[PDB]
Amino acid sequence: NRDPASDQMKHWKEQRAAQKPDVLTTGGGNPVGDKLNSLTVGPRGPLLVQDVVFTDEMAHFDRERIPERVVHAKGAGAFGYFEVTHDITRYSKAKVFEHIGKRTPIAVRFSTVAGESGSADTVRDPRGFAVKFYTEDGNWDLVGNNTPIFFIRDALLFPSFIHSQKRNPQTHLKDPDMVWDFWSLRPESLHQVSFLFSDRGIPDGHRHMDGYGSHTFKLVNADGEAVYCKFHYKTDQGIKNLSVEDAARLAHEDPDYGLRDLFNAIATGNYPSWTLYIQVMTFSEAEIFPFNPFDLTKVWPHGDYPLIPVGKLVLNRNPVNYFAEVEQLAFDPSNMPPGIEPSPDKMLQGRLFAYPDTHRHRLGPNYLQIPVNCPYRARVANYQRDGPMCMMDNQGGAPNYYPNSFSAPEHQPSALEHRTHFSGDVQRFNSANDDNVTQVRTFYLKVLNEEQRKRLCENIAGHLKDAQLFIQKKAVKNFSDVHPEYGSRIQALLDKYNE
Amino acid sequence: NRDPASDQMKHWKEQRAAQKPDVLTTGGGNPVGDKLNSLTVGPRGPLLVQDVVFTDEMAHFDRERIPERVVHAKGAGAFGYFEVTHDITRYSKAKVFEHIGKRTPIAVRFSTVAGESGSADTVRDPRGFAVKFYTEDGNWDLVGNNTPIFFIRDALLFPSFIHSQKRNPQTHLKDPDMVWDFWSLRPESLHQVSFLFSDRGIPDGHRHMDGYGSHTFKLVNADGEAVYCKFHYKTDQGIKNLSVEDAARLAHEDPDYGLRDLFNAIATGNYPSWTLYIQVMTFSEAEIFPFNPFDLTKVWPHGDYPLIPVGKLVLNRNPVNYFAEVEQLAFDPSNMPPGIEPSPDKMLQGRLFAYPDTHRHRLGPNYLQIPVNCPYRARVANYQRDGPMCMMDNQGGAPNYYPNSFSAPEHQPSALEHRTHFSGDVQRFNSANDDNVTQVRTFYLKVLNEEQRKRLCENIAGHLKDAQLFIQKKAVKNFSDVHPEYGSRIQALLDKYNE
Amino acid sequence: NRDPASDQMKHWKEQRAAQKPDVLTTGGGNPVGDKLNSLTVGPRGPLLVQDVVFTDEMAHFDRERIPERVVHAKGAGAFGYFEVTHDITRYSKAKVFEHIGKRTPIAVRFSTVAGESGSADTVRDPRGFAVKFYTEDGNWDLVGNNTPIFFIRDALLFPSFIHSQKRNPQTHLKDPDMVWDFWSLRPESLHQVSFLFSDRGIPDGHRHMDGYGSHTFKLVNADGEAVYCKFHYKTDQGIKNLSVEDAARLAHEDPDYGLRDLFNAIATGNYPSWTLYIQVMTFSEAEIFPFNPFDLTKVWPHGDYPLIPVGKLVLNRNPVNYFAEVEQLAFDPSNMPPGIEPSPDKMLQGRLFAYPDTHRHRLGPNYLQIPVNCPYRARVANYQRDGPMCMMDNQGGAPNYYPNSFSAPEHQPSALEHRTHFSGDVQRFNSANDDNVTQVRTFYLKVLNEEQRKRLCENIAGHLKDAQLFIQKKAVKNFSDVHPEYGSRIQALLDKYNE
Amino acid sequence: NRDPASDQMKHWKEQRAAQKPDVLTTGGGNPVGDKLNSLTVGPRGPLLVQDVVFTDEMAHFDRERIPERVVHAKGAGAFGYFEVTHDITRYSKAKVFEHIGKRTPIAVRFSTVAGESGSADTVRDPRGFAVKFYTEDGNWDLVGNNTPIFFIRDALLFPSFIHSQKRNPQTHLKDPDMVWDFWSLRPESLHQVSFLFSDRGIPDGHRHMDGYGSHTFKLVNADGEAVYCKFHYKTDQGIKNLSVEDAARLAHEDPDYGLRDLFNAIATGNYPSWTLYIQVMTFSEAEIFPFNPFDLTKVWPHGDYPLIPVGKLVLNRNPVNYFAEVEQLAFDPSNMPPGIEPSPDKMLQGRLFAYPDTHRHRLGPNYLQIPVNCPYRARVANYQRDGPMCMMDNQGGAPNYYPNSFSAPEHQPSALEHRTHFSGDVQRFNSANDDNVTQVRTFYLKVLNEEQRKRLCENIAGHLKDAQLFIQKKAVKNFSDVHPEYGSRIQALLDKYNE
Numbered sequence A, B, C, D: 001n002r003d004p005a006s007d008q009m010k011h012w013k014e015q016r017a018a019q020k021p022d023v024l025t026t027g028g029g030n031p032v033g034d035k036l037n038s039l040t041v042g043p044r045g046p047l048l049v050q051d052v053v054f055t056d057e058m059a060h061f062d063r064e065r066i067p068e069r070v071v072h073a074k075g076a077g078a079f080g081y082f083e084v085t086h087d088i089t090r091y092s093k094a095k096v097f098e099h100i101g102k103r104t105p106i107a108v109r110f111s112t113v114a115g116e117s118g119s120a121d122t123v124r125d126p127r128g129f130a131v132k133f134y135t136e137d138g139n140w141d142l143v144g145n146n147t148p149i150f151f152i153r154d155a156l157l158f159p160s161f162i163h164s165q166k167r168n169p170q171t172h173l174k175d176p177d178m179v180w181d182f183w184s185l186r187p188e189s190l191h192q193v194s195f196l197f198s199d200r201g202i203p204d205g206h207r208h209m210d211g212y213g214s215h216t217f218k219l220v221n222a223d224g225e226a227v228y229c230k231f232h233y234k235t236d237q238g239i240k241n242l243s244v245e246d247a248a249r250l251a252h253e254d255p256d257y258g259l260r261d262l263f264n265a266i267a268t269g270n271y272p273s274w275t276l277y278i279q280v281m282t283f284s285e286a287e288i289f290p291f292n293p294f295d296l297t298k299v300w301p302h303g304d305y306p307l308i309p310v311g312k313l314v315l316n317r318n319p320v321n322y323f324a325e326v327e328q329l330a331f332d333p334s335n336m337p338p339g340i341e342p343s344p345d346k347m348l349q350g351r352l353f354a355y356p357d358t359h360r361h362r363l364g365p366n367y368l369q370i371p372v373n374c375p376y377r378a379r380v381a382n383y384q385r386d387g388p389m390c391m392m393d394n395q396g397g398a399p400n401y402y403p404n405s406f407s408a409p410e411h412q413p414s415a416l417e418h419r420t421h422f423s424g425d426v427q428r429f430n431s432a433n434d435d436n437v438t439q440v441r442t443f444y445l446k447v448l449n450e451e452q453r454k455r456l457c458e459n460i461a462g463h464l465k466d467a468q469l470f471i472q473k474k475a476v477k478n479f480s481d482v483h484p485e486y487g488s489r490i491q492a493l494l495d496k497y498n499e
């Protein structure tokens, strides 16, 4: 016998006991008599528009594909839940953290980034780790990566970035000249660049990796007090990466490696877990931080801000229909229930917009009306109506303007966004030179040993080599700024690759 | 106080009862602490992106509109049932006729023909009478209208017709030349044109008008024997038209008069009803018939073809939410249960294609998933997946290829099309001159009496007059062919009309 | 020979006289043999899916309809130009007012608000007066209204407003209970509501109504020197409006009266024009202003803030294709070139989001490329790419990331937005009580004379009379808050109406 | 210096030199001041809605993606011309062949099949070969392949087939159980399934393979006589296939091998070319012939039906912008100028619908209006109007109904379709027994030599080595039904793989 994976269609007909098979039908529910031989005038004559069975199917077939994620197209998914094992109600008053043992059902999706839908899992790229919490207050999406930091700190340079990583407008090939001209001119990436070309670059599956909310957020307690926080949900399966070697063999032996490793893990019953933590920084402590507490290209050293365990993330159910439940999902950072709010983290401020923006496009206006995306542990109610493909509903014949004198939905002041005071002019404030080295240096010669320190200078040079020379220096320079040796090793290697 | 319609909100609230309102949430179900004031820095400062409340809402509002139906955009809808007051199971074996007494939930939408969503019901124009049956063998969309005949005999000239019947491409106004130039160049229109300007051109409210299927159809029984039939449903509310002045008045006082009439009649228990009948014709007779039995412009005389009583059509329910229940109601002439097949009606043949084609574009590739359209009385199982906005499970893990050896949906030798045998060179046979007078001449003389004739012409003469002298000639010319007098009688009015 | 609008097809045939007709082709360009009779196997047989002429033409016919603008569905559009005639450059460095005699192409559209596409023109309703300028610095849209004020003062209570106006979620009929229940609950509307029900609520055609910017905008000259402002452009054709009697008649007689009137004028050289002035309030003034200077329901009295002439708006070019030129026409208040900026007017701010947004839905992601919408007088060059229905050269090989060292477009540091200082807490400041009457009273008492006040209350009562009693009560109350006479004069009429 | 594909940007800057870079603007052409730092309230403050530079850019990015082709997603495309070399004026009256030395602009896209957009070029999968001839009679899309046969002879099966190749509905991974199950239960595949695993399964470069109109078509001369034919465009650069290990190496070393390879050729003057031939068969012969002369899994033998020469296919132009020219490219078999006509193929006929149809989905209603799809060597003129993103002018003010009396587009009898007399009942004729083994055996034996013969079994087994035995068996039952040793060798291999 094979693995639970391949034995899919197998484990399907079985459980289907001896119950006869459903009756093939058209979308209209008309029982199809013969769906193998099209209607034709004569055995060698043309086809009639009359074969609606055919028309009905081909028509549906011609419209399956929808736009793939603008980023993170390739990924895996599965559901499970979250459970409380610590009390942090002092910090946030969210319903998901209510009492201890408070298990909220979740939905998570792993994925790559730069590659398309046909791409393989096993390759150097950050990883998409987004959780969908279904809470009585509504849904809460923690759209996070496998790291607490990203490459850029101003949303505006993101589209340009994603481009710099994806194909060339003309050749449609991957273009290093682009990948590095951008990185080179934007040293802020330094930090997250180094993390990428580290060993973590390619985990073993989606399980032996770490999850983070990356950004800085804001918790609020039932007492109206607030404090900035950072979420870290480590892996209980342990950290594990794949040598550039395997990453390549796997790249072709099983392009969907990480994909079926997650399905079998849960099929065989070995459910992947993660222990959720959170750092904590008061506003007072925020004004003090030697750095921008809201800079996405920075971290809060654990020593100065220790981790507090909060919960256990347990994925235990495997998706049935992938399209409907995984590809069709929708993780929107904007979705945050009372007790949780965004920080003025310029990058975070960008996700507040983009996700619902695209979602409406990828899936359509009512993209939340999709089962997987619908917040069922809540009771959506308001003054919104219509839209294409309006399922449900449509919120019945209830009044549609606010305010109204007809007992239609009223607001709840208990969920008012926490009020903070901000002073200063309205201007395009430059964050470019917000120190893109320090924390980086203490990562090259403080977080990594000599072994991986080198594996880095090797990985990087192996790619940089392909970029125009003038580019290489503009890069070596920056790296150097993190530490001379850093740029020395790399540069060296390059020249050897440079013939 | 006033009418039930206008009392919509009232009642809704009284039913709502003492039940406290629902917490006003965002699309994501998150409660809103205050959906009346925006998040602005300062009481007179800028608006913030961070106001995902505003953006959430506003956004759905920006997508509230879907393209109105290409034709018959304005209308009203109601649900109810259908009863089997007779056993017509000798001709058609459709389960919707199974046994006397059986009932099948129906859905109907009345509509005008040309005017967009904002026009007025009380205007001369044919009328849409769609009857959707939710059977146990899929659905059945009998797209009827108040008239058994139409204007054209071949689809190809349909998109062209509707055009002439709408706004000039440059001015955007109703064009008399666009209208009459077309009607004059296509005599086959001579029939319905007459019926159109007659007293039936404006039926007083929906309840007071008949419904027809026009297209010759096919009824297959148990033995597989087949026949051609027509579908007529006479109104139990008796016929009632609206004088030009009484309608032309209601055009403003109440442009949605028809919509209100219906809702109101129902809301007051007074349900509109229709008896169903059909006309049966043998391939042999259809052979002998003096005309083309599938010529939409002609009718099967009562005498030669009496109407057999079928069952009843009760409208005892009003829509809850209009946009989700009526606006989206989609009727595809293709939905025919095993037992009702189309006919070689060149006109019908076209529709077979169009409805789903457009429904796939107005509502979406998965429109058959909309609650109203879904055949909730049968089990839809087939090999079609994905498509934007996939509701339900999408046949979960069930296979997707046919045939297959995994106990997936099967065939239905019983639901096989009937086998008719045609012959002749496959080409484009000009149907332009298949007697465009006979029946028109029988209408203008034996069906109408002098006062009814008088009207017809004045009605016609008053509209045709705005066309160019030349079209007027061409127009009158065709009328004389039906009958000398018809022509001159109208002509007369024109010369006067030309003051 | 009638009005130029009627003879549209005439002058066409005429226009291309000696020039022989072009060949009829499918979408693909292939020539069409016989476009009248579909390809049916046998003169009375089915329709071959092999017939492409049909399918091609039919499938397209099936997708002709796109959503109609969310609000202001029914309108009229013409193209003309703008000519500067006064140096106001000391207030805005906008390249549009650049210098005396300056000519900038414009495109305007007139509209109603609540009615859908079939809706009648001559009805009480504000009027849209959206201009589009194709300035050398990019398109500058100034979306004017036939009134310099609006009902609500916060963008959040807007979707609700429109809802109250349009059809009821259930019956689908206009609901006066809905309308007035709303206005009654938000007295800020008094001002505009009063204007609306005044003779000005039903202008005789588009040629007799002033256009306004309503919102306060911020102008910025060459020395980054700012100044708030109001946009006014009075008709040069004289203020004229249809009585309540002519309006109803026309309502059914000529639903497209505005269209017809506007088309004809131009068509016959009788070009309409508007002079554009602007009031100038300095930051120091907007400070001590007796009201919030960014409150859409208020106006800067001519007395303390004059009107400085700018130039003229002239329309002299009818649309050739309505759909392609007047329909797909989309204006974004967000489009403002260097020198013309927004104010903190909350009501305005929202608009910065919604117009481009909704457009991305109605017209489509790449709608900015639709001819009538492209800033043809400017040269786009950005890192934007792809999306459906992408024309032009998608900037071709051009680099796609920013910054880049490959000579792609750069940022002009001279068009950097002006910078203002705002301080305070950031939150939901409740601006529902910023005086909802003062100005209203001035309008009722000093702007209108008895003759007028008489029609107004009559008019208000005409509609309101139908709102449930408790609603009418609440309504008269407010009016009284403007003036005892106001509420009373109506009340009487009310009690009068109730038998 | 490196290859052309690598030096893409390098050249852009080079040639685009001696020119000040363009001004980076917005969608509306407004110059941006700084596109690197979003607008906020103070250095550490929230992002303002005011920032439109941001939104515009972001939203537009949030939509860059459109759905990929349901099949043949991964591909490379280029442009060239077709040159007549021989006179087959007698077989076709088609203008594209008018004379000797007649050039016609063509566009081409090569593509794998069951692989998603991100997949890798080199993999056992048929190659998509589609040429778009822009002729004076519009565009004639010759939607071919690198093989002259397919896996099934009935459209209906296609969706079911295609799904079998793609991913598993639940585990989303590629699944052999599905693969082989389909083929096992469907023997017609045999012929094409053999060719696949043959040495031709993985062609080296897109230039070292052939082209096969595949289907059977019809030809019509000026005198009206018709006949059937087979299209063949043999590679001039010669056939060069890739090994199995090599293929799987570039598979991850360079997954975009096709693109690069092909792009570089044309980039250096090494323009590839193909010779277009035609096999001819007269109706008479179409009668004598011995299995269905249209069976898509049957090829005419050069022996009895020889290869006639026609012309040259030369591709000497690379796309400037890929998304604009290749991604948006749309080839519709339904496009066919006079002289070329479909044939009964129960497979082809269906294609005539899937292509234009699925396009109205993937790209949009007016997709034929996208620059590369437009039939620019002709002149579209008809009665089709509107639809979203209506580019051009919608045809201006021309009359929109046919017929008309205003000199609008007329028709050409010259373009009438050939009339074939088809006799025989109208029903679903089984095609499962049309011989799916005779021709096949001839391959394995004749066309194939002992050497390659081995690499087939080895390959056909290397894959099937993952399908439940019960499946493996069924398969061997056919291969052997082809020829004893075929399944023999296979079965011998399979056993070892079964460890």
Ligand code: HEM
Residues within 6 Å of the ligand: B058, B062, C068, C069, C070, C071, C072, C073, C075, C108, C109, C110, C111, C128, C129, C130, C142, C143, C144, C145, C155, C158, C213, C214, C215, C331, C333, C346, C347, C348, C349, C350, C351, C352, C354, C355, C358
């Ligand atoms: C922030 C609140 C606003 C939002 C979200 C908003 C939204 C809309 C929407 C959805 C339409 C439909 C347009 C169409 O279908 O053609 C519209 C039309 C219009 N808006 Fe309002 N708008 C806002 C504020 C205003 C203000 C502040 C003005 C003052 C120019 C204005 C002027 C117009 C005009 C002129 C039209 C009609 C355009 C035409 O048909 O030519 N809007 N607006």
